[PDB]
Amino acid sequence: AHEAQKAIARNSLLIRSLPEQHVDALLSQAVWRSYDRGETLFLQEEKAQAIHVVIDGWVKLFRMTPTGSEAVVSVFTRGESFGEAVALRNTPYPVSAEAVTPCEVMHIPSPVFVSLMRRDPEICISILATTFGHLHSLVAQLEQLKAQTGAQRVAEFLLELCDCDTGACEVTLPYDKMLIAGRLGMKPESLSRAFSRLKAAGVTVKRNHAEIEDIALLRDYAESDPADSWS
Amino acid sequence: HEAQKAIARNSLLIRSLPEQHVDALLSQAVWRSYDRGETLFLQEEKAQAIHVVIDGWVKLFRMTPTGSEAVVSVFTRGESFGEAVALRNTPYPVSAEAVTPCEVMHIPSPVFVSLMRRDPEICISILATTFGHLHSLVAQLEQLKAQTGAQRVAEFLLELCDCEVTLPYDKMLIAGRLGMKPESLSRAFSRLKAAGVTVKRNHAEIEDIALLRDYAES
């Protein structure tokens, strides 16, 4: 049931961390919700009663400054989970979450996940083994010299958003491209230059989506020697 | 073992634990020294401990089909390894060898695992922390920009500091960890002369912390 959506959810950090034999039973207890653009998923200080996985669209997390301004903390999109830590600690949400585009989300109720581990601590032991190996892998990667240019980093981001490894591709983006800039740690104008350069690699960015004519061509751009002018 | 436990607390294993559990775990540590070239363990043996380097450098290597040793990792002071393998109780996938004289604090696997088995709430709380640290590391990788090789080495040297830092005699080990070709590493070091770094023996000498950081920040 809900098979295509569940396949998307399997790419998330939450679901990738689980032992494979327990995934189906847990996905079968999901609550599926849609959100309009601008709709609240949850608010700061509410109880963390579920862990969240974006199936489609873009969700932003933000906190209120005491001056009253929304400070964006993160944006998440299809195949990405969030709220794991706070749901397992059962502490109040430190941020609010709002749909930036129309969204579909899969919510896993916290007690469904927690009770599994309290009944069988071998499950939490397997999950933790996996997350440790993953932490080590990310720490080792952060240690390794990065040479990619700004444009290359955006190419890489776009490639990760596409499902396939060849052919044309289309990825939906927030209208406000500053959210992507934030995510990539780039100045707004740097993101714009990157998009401009990527025209030459087959990428056209529009208001609500990007068009990649050839995934292979884009991957070539990304992988090419940063110190070379490309094509 | 006060100074050494403070070092152990910088490791991923120990950072991941709730404070209220650290001391009773460090109290059951097995403490060992190794001379350069000595084996900590061999590939395919039983995973009897999780390993925290307190002093020196340890390499992990895997046997290849044609009988070469493929270096997979090199760890130093304040770093843990073998958590996943210990929790799964699978045979060691690598061998581990001291590349300088070393001190290691070994947390026996049954001590750590049996703690997770008895009180599932403890495992859940450690898992919560690790998910948080995973998101934080993904975000750092997403925002990581290009830097020069010399800059990468500078930051690496600064991280090793609390002035002097001992490195492995075999410079391939650092090259691998930093994802750099040996030549690039060589070039990076000579380049770093102008930042007050010199490489007498298998020791790095940094004249002044703040100056090197200036080089690193550019």
Q: Do B53 and B3 reside in the same domain of the chain?
A: yes
Interface residue A187 vs chain B (CB under 8 A) = no
CATH of residue A164: 1.10.10.10
Interface residue B167 vs chain A (CB under 8 A) = no
Question: Which A-chain residues 102-161 have CB contacts (< 8 A) with chain B?
Answer: 114, 117-118, 121-122, 124-136, 138-150, 153, 157
Q: Which of chain A's residues have a Cβ under 8 Å away from the Cβ of B127?
A: 88, 117, 124, 127-128, 131
Q: Do B154 and B130 reside in the same domain of the chain?
A: no
Q: Do A160 and A102 reside in the same domain of the chain?
A: no
Domain finish residue from A113, A136, A159: A136
Q: Do B99 and B31 reside in the same domain of the chain?
A: yes
C-beta separation of A219 from A159 below 8 A: yes
Which segments of chain B does DSSP mark as H helices, in order? 2-8, 12-15, 19-26, 83-88, 109-118, 120-143, 149-160, 172-177, 182-192, 209-216
Closest residue in B to A88 (Cα) is: B128
Q: Do B69 and B118 reside in the same domain of the chain?
A: yes
C-beta separation of B150 from B192 below 8 A: yes
- Picking from A45, A9, A51, A135, the residue whose alpha carbon sits closest to that of residue B129 is A135
Angle made by CA atoms A137, A143, A146, in degrees to the nearest 5? 110
Q: Do B210 and B196 reside in the same domain of the chain?
A: yes
Domain finish residue from B68, B103, B135: B135
Q: Do B193 and B95 reside in the same domain of the chain?
A: no
Q: Do A129 and A150 reside in the same domain of the chain?
A: no
- Picking from A37, A10, A175, the residue whose alpha carbon sits closest to that of residue A104 is A37
Q: Identify the experimental approach.
A: X-ray
Q: Which residues of A106-125 are buried (b: 16+ CB within 10 A; e: fewer)?
A: bbbbbebbbebbeeebebbb
Q: At what angle do helices A110-119 and B120-143 cross, to 10 degrees?
A: 130
Q: Do A168 and A63 reside in the same domain of the chain?
A: no
Q: Do A2 and A104 reside in the same domain of the chain?
A: yes
Give the CA count within 13 Å in the CB-facing half-sphere of A96.
15
Our count of domains for chain A comes to 2
Terminal Cα-to-Cα distance of chain A (whole angstroms): 46
**B3-10, long-range: CB < 8 A, 24+ apart:** B4/B31, B4/B54, B4/B103, B4/B105, B5/B105, B7/B54, B7/B55, B7/B77, B7/B78, B8/B52, B8/B54, B8/B78, B8/B105, B10/B78, B10/B79
Closest residue in A to B90 (Cα) is: A129
Q: What is the DSSP letter of B17?
A: S
- Provide the residue range defining the domain that includes A58: 1-136
Residue B145 to residue B195: CA distance in whole angstroms: 22
State whether residue B87 is helix, strand or coil. helix
Q: Do B69 and B31 reside in the same domain of the chain?
A: yes
Residue A22 to residue B104: CA distance in whole angstroms: 37
Q: Do A195 and A208 reside in the same domain of the chain?
A: yes
CATH of residue A73: 2.60.120.10
Residue B186 to residue A88: CA distance in whole angstroms: 47
Contact A74 B134 (CB under 8 A): no
Domain finish residue from B68, B101, B135: B135
Number of inter-chain CB pairs under 8 A, A vs B? 131
List the beta bridge partners of residue B31.
Answer: B105
Consecutive H or E run containing B52 = strand B49-55
